[PDB]
Amino acid sequence: LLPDKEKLLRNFLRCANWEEKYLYIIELGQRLPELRDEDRSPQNSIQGAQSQVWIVMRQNAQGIIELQGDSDAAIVKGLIAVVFILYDQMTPQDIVNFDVRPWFCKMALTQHLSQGLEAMIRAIRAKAAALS
Amino acid sequence: LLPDKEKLLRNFLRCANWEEKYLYIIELGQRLPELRDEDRSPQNSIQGAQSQVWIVMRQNAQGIIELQGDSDAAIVKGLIAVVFILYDQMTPQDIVNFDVRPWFCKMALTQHLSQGLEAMIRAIRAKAAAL
Amino acid sequence: IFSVDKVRADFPVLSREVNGLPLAYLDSAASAQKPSQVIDAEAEFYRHGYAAVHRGIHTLSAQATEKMENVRKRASLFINARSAEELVFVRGTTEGINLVANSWGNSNVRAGDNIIISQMEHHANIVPWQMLCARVGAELRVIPLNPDGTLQLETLPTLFDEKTRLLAITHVSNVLGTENPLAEMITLAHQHGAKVLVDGAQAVMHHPVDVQALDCDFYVFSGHKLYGPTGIGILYVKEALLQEMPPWEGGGSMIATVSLSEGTTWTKAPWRFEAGTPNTGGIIGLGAALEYVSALGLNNIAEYEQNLMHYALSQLESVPDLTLYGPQNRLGVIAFNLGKHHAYDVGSFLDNYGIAVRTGHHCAMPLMAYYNVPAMCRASLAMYNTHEEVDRLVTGLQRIHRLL
Amino acid sequence: IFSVDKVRADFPVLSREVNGLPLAYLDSAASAQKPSQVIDAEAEFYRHGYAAVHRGIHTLSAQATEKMENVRKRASLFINARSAEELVFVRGTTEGINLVANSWGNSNVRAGDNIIISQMEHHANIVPWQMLCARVGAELRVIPLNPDGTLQLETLPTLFDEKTRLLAITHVSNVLGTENPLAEMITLAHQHGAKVLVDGAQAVMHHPVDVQALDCDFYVFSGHKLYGPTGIGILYVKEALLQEMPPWEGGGSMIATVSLSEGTTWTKAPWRFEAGTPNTGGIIGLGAALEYVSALGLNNIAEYEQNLMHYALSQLESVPDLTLYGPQNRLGVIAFNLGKHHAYDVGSFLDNYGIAVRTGHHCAMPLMAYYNVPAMCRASLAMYNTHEEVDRLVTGLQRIHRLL
């Protein structure tokens, strides 16, 4: 399973350098649940990520958002994992109002790497807003 | 009337500064006889000098060429007159084979002004060659 | 307050000597001089951080893309646009107007419609609409001018009908310096169903412009007229319209997939109208110039320029047989003619005195034909011009009047 | 002979630290670094002699127009065109191809015809022709690829026909580095009454080019890849074919007259396709860049580049599971993948080693498709790239393979 945003940030800042951080992103991607061959369709495509990125969001029996995804680029999939960790167990309104900037600030992902990440965040916020 | 190319270049080089040269050019233009309102038509209009320019060329009772010109701009008319002087009293072939370049160089016009005069000379040479 | 001494300290061309004399550049309307800041911005981006700007992988490319998008954001804040995704980078006002006319036009104007322009309009705000009318088969109606260089607005009821599609009007006229009532004309246009495009290539460098206060649907301007470099310019489009306009130029970046058997699809807004490699250095310099002008405060610039214009119009009364064109409340430019003397001669002389003014039709020939003249002499009163240059121009005009 | 030390000396960017480590810019095929000479030519033009260029009456304007036209002559003499009036300034290869397709396409292509492209073309040389075939209802035909990244010339018979209007081919591929046989393709296309457009954007910077020895009808290239500023590009056209093509963009300067009652008449060649203000600074910089390259000598540059390429190909044989794309006789670029790992991950790790290589589809999706891959990494070996950067790439790939 994937760690919560707290454990994620702690384990990431625990990384001594940057290669460890990039492989940790790669792994976090490698932990995601596989995507159904039906869901990997042009209806679940994300542009601007410089790689084929699929992301599906849906409300379960309640008003909770359940996310899944995939990317043919390892580090992009790890970014999918991290974004899912940040937005985990939240309704569309929580997603729209939640400011994710400080978490990235605390993990330094635009100074190392980040525009495909912006595409992912924008698409997720668009789905959440369309739902709310 | 207009002086010959010799007197023209002489009196031009005799100018003390560029203001006198430009005013002498404006005056030379002023000396050009008036153009017939019929000749002031598109068939005789020239292009590329940034101002309306008409130049009619026609062979007189002999193989000699007679030029009439006008331009809504003073200095343009003066350059018309300078050309008429440089091409004065010559047959079509004599105009085709006359090298105006050293005259303008000794007058240093491209360094104090440049393309409209080139276009006028090209039009006159095209007429002379067609004849 | 404003201090033209400090300001001129930054433009290096203002130290040139034109024809043995110190240069007095009075053609900023044709193109403004660039401060050292903008030159250095562009050259430094070139020296210590140039790379491709298509979301590249390596650090330099991603930084360059960030820089370009930051410049777009600055420009969107300049005109006060809702979203930075409502501004497209172009070559200039000419290419922007062409883009709007082809993209939005070819899909929004058909036979039987009609487009409205003004008789004072620049060629850049005239020719594209003529091409469009010739392609689709629409009419082009012209807002007439009054003798004083203002629009005959009373004719608006007879030019706007249920088939008026677009009003392509000029903000500040590059010949008369007249400022049209943008908000009121735009309200009248929106009351009929016809969009509005505004050529502000001349208005931006003088006072603040607020694309949301005018409610204009399209706004255009060029970068070389805002003290920035050439080859770059801004076209603002309302997000509602911009998100529905098809693509103009086709190539890389603006696409999303490119197939030889399943067609091609296009990318989202702004970028869909930016084919090939953008002018990255030009955008850097344009952002630098934007920052410069904002640091100087457009209101102080406008105050200084209005005071200088009043001083110059007072000084040009002591020039006999001078004829001015435009309203008293003109901005930035003075168009005139010295007696019956042709503009070409007045200008050639003035330049021989080191004074640089523009002479001819100024890409506004319908204005000339209205005024019954063949050309005019325009002088530009930019933020870096001094009272002493106004005195030099009055001196040159008087000496020319004598010698001719 | 050549000397890469003195050459790198002139590139300030080549002293920049990426991610904490000395940079090794191997992405020149997407964009080339500029020598301080070009930066400085542009800066000096902005500092000591800028002014609008529309044959202005004042000294600065006329000097600037002469500078732009002298740069136009330098361009025409670089590729070796008959006349300096056989070249047009555009924003880049993309805009040039769009212009060729819109001005010359709409009038020379009718329904039923067919255009011939190649499966390795850049998007800039794919999208314009697709849009054109949509506007006129023509058929786009493609020359396939062989496994080695060379064109299947054998398939030219079944492609050319009496309806074949144009062959749009690339001189050198930005992805495989392949150099197509332009002379023979052009002879075969002329035998069929078909014009030839050559996208040589990747060819001008590696060896001499001669538009008469090729006899091509149109030629295109961009300056940001020629070690020169952005937003400037050269479109060469045959004088005969050029003087007849209709004008594309409408605006000022490119009109002989502009009447709202008698229609608009155009101006002569090149300048007919230069609407509004042209990028004077970009053009000055492009002149400077052409001068610099001509000084270095394309022959010495090609020698050094082939030497560096053979060395890089010898050293890459020690990288396990490295798949390369293209023939052995490539120019400037190596396109690869590291085992099964995605291109983005290899490029990302390389970047964090200071190695700037590009990753993705390189604006050539049909190529990716032909190679059953979703993306490649591309590393370019420019005239300023050393052997140390080759060794660094090899070592970085080895480490990336061991770690992944």
Residue numbers in the entry:
A (entry chain C): 3 to 115, 120 to 138
B (entry chain D): 3 to 115, 120 to 137
C (entry chain B), D (entry chain A): 2 to 405
Task: Give the authors' words.
SufS is a dimeric, pyridoxal 5'-phosphate-dependent enzyme that uses cysteine as a substrate to generate alanine and a covalent persulfide on an active site cysteine residue. SufS enzymes are activated by an accessory transpersulfurase protein, either SufE or SufU depending on the organism, which accepts the persulfide product and delivers it to downstream partners for Fe-S assembly. Due to the buried nature of the active site, these enzymes require a dedicated accessory protein called a transpersulfurase to act as a second substrate in the reaction.
Here, we report the first costructure for the SufS–SufE complex from E. coli. We obtained crystals of SufE C51A/E107C bound to SufS and solution of this structure indicated an EcSufS/EcSufE complex with 1:1 stoichiometry between the S and E subunits. The crystals diffracted anisotropically to 3.2 Å along the b-axis and c-axis, but to only 4.2 Å along the a-axis. The overall structure contains one EcSufE monomer per EcSufS active site and is asymmetric with one EcSufE positioned closer to the EcSufS active site, though neither pairing is in a persulfide transfer ready position. The overall asymmetry is best described as a rotation of EcSufE toward EcSufS resulting in a closure of approximately 7°. The more open interaction is based primarily on contacts between EcSufE and the α16 helix (residues 343–353) of EcSufS, while the closure creates additional interactions between the C51 and R119 loops on EcSufE and the R56 loop and α4 helix of the adjacent SufS monomer. H343, D346, and Y354 of EcSufS hydrogen bond to D74, backbone amides of A76 and I77, and E21 on EcSufE, respectively. The remainder of the α16 helix interface is made up of nonpolar interactions between EcSufE and Y345 and F350 on EcSufS. These two regions form layered interactions with the N terminus of the α4 helix (residues 60–67) and the adjacent R56 loop (residues 56–59) on EcSufS, with R56 appearing to block formation of a closer complex.
